[PDB]
Design a protein around this ligand. Sequence first.
Ligand SMILES: Nc1ncnc2c1ncn2[C@@H]1O[C@H](COP(=O)(O)OP(=O)(O)OP(=O)(O)O)[C@@H](O)[C@H]1O
Ligand SMILES: COc1ccc2c(c1)CN(Cc1ccc(C(=O)O)cc1)CCS2
Lengths: 204, 436, 273, 107, 97
Amino acid sequence: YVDASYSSKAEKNFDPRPVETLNVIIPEKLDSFINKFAEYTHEKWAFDKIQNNWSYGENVDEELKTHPMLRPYKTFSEKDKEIYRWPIKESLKAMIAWEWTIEKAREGEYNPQPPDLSGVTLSRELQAMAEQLAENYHNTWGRKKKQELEAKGGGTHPLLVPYDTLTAKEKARDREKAQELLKFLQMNGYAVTRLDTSSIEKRF
Amino acid sequence: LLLQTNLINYVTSIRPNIFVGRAEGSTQYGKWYFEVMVDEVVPFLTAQATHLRVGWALTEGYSPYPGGGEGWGGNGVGDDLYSYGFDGLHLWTGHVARPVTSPGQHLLAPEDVVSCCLDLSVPSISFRINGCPVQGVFEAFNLDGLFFPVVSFSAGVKVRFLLGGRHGEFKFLPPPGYAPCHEAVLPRERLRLEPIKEYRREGPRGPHLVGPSRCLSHTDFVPCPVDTVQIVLPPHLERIREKLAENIHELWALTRIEQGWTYGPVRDDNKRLHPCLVNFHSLPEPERNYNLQMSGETLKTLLALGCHVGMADEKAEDNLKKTKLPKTYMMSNGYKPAPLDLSHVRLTPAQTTLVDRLAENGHNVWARDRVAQGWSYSAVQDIPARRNPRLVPYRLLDEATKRSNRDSLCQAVRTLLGYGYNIEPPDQEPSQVENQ
Amino acid sequence: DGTVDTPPCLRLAHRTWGSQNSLVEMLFLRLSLPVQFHQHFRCTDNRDDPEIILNTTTYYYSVRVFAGQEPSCVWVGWVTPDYHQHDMNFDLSKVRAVTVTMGDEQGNVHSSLKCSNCYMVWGGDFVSPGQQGRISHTDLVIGCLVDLATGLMTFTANGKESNTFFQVEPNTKLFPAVFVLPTHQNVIQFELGKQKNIMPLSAAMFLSERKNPAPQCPPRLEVQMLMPVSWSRMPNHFLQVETRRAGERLGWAVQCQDPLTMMALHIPEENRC
Amino acid sequence: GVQVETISPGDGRTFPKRGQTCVVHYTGMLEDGKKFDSSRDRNKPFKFMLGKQEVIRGWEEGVAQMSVGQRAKLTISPDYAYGATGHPGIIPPHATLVFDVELLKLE
Amino acid sequence: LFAGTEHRAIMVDSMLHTVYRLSRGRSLTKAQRDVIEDCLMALCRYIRPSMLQHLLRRLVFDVPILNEFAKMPLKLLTNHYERCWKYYCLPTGWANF
Ligand SMILES: Nc1ncnc2c1ncn2[C@@H]1O[C@H](COP(=O)(O)OP(=O)(O)OP(=O)(O)O)[C@@H](O)[C@H]1O
Ligand SMILES: COc1ccc2c(c1)CN(Cc1ccc(C(=O)O)cc1)CCS2
């Protein structure tokens, strides 16, 4: 037997410790990507609406079962644009806090014409970091979820488990989110760097 | 409403073991021809008229079982959509008889010769009876299988297959471009007449039960060499790649010296003259570069197959013995070619399996290259017609030639081991083809 | 059963869909009774006209692909009684086809008939390339029209006439058939209804109902599935065939002399014995 | 309404005339492909004399066009056979009859 | 009676977690604790191996601690893998499981 995920945190109820990055200063030398991709993820949500077969609307309503405030950039208020960037801000903080320096090898630069997909493959070393980042998505998600739950002291959320323990079907939420960020870094050429074990050596 | 009963005759089909088909990149020829001569037919041996049809059938689907079936039983050629028959008066397909016009129409009678033509390019099937054309053709049919000659008959018939060559001289000249069916026999099989998907046969002590029969597919004649697009060889492998071509040429020249080849300006097999039969360096470089493309793939296929190879030893390359041809066994030039001496070299059993895979790939690379040039398989070699007996996938090749390619690849591997380069046999990945 | 607004139907449902050990594979279905074209073809509100409906030779039936079942995995049409193609990767390219062409002494094609055992349309040809939402709110209702007096077959997507059509020879037997790969609990539904001035299938399958425009689903009409393997009886005796190489110039000889006869039981509607 | 399509050629010289007994072996099927009669099953050739209206009128012209030893396929229109009345229990009304007839000899 | 409860796997899994969580309960007498442990052992003996996946996931986090509460899970895991070894080892898996 060879485990597909041949890696471990080697750490240690269950208390998911997040990653401390607010204390350390966030480098802003790559702000051309920080702000652009922060609104690009929400720009991809506009493409998700046309796939939902229900378009975007201006008025707030619960009947369209979609985002009610999604507006074309001509009449799109920046109040929501200036608050949707926060998850991306900490996402870039998270991947840079784990001693992973990012270098811009290249030097350049209502519909998101460039399509960001997740069905393509990627190298093992770089994808391992994305899965580690996806783990940080879950523990931070688990941390805030358990803070509300810990007020009772009895019972626990069914997904309050370590990231390696949960199966793939419940992993695709954080898996695709981390991969999608890595895919955006892939076609542009962002180099982030901190093993080579054959299948025979991975057998039990 | 009520079930109907009637007495019917049993009908059996007999085919040669000749299978032809069309596929993208296939090594098979496209146009085929054969004849069937009728010697004796009893028009009414029983209350029902005697069955006799001639035509082509498809391997994947034509399985006439004795007894019942479509319509009123007695299913033969043209009683389904996998066969296309001709009984002298009608063209049979899909169990429907369509009258056809020929000079002097009559049901198949003694001394009648039926000529069947199969042109897979259109595709089209045409017939001729006693030399006159039959004004009716099957066309635009399926090609997902192999086509074989077939005759369906009841009791009271006596026919002879005319397949050309030594297996029945043709009474009429085949139309231009068509090849006799005897040229389509595979190297590993002998021509014979057999039933079709029989589940029973006679034996010494009694009837023998027979299971399903393994059948080839039209894709089995398409060579599938491993991908070599990733052209990235290590620099130590790149330099030794050209030197590998030098050694294999001498080994190829040495084997020709055993066959009697000598030095000569002209390169002919029958004349046994070879310019390379002097020395690897005296061999012309452009002639040496002829197999340099092949020599480059030989090392590349090692990387392609997954083998781990590197310059483990450099001192081994520097110092190594050189086997030379005996002075008694000299060519016209009289010099002694010096291929690398690798008697001390030994191969692990896993490495021997690698040589077999290398030999299989090398044949397939040569095969698909010839197909792109227009070459096709034929039992009889015809250089002007670009017909070659070895224009077949390696698995279908006969053992005599299969061993010959295996020995040549072994020397090439021995040459690499003679240089001391490490060769790691890949961890073999099993697979199940599921042919049926 | 047929209600006031719906015709009688034969609905297929997947018992174990979604659950563990569920079997999902290509399913080949057909109705138990065929429609037979006439021996000779003719030369060259929303209420049926009584004179038209009693003289028409066009018959109709439709298949409802329920929402959730992908139309791309549904084939609707007809099969001849000699269809035995149990392909797990079926598509319209696997359908057996052959053209028989007749001509005079010098070319001059005067007859080109087309033969097949499966006349079907693909459900994937009746879906617009919308951005997504391919599982539609509306079920796809593919209708099939056959004119027994002309041998012409036409199809309708959602009431819109399709471009595909087929032509068949007289005395042809066609079974209403649907080939589907299940993707939902509700898969398909044979709708044995009628259109304006068009008779239902029950009018063509039964002699006693030739002039009855009311749709019917008699008990004999049932859904049949294609079974890959069946038991068959081995004959007690087999033809003695002698094969030998008569010589270099004579070739290979086939010979069979002793007669053999069996008593065949023929099933008329299935055209097999 | 008789069409005579040859299956195997005869002598091509001797033809049956009026008042001459014809000995034939036949197998009759409906034009859709359903057999209803055959002298082969009874293993006894069928004998009849032309001009005496012993058989259906379709056989009168069809056999007269054949030669001794010839095997031919006769397609008879309903008018030249039993027609509207038909043969009760054997041949449906307005049925076209197809016969495979071999003229064995004349006597 | 829990042998064929595949159709109600969500409720069965919740039952297994609750009884397991009861076993790791303070203020429980020794007599009460073994009754809870016996119930958990009995349930896992008849429940299909596929439905025990979530319970095993919880045990992966707890057993390696090897505290005083780990005695019962060790016995539970021993019986589970001894009984269902074909389910994990054989490529074809356990028969009808
Ligand atoms: N580069 C190559 N050229 C020709 N044959 C090759 C080559 N590499 C391998 N082979 C093998 O050689 C056999 C066919 O060789 P071929 O018939 O061309 O030989 P030949 O007639 O002696 O050569 P030539 O055509 O150059 O006179 C096949 O088994 C094929 O796999
Ligand atoms: C595996 O590789 C092979 C295998 C078989 C053959 C050749 C190369 C050689 N090719 C032509 C050739 C002959 C001699 C030379 C040379 O001596 O330089 C180069 C090419 C076809 C003849 S059989």
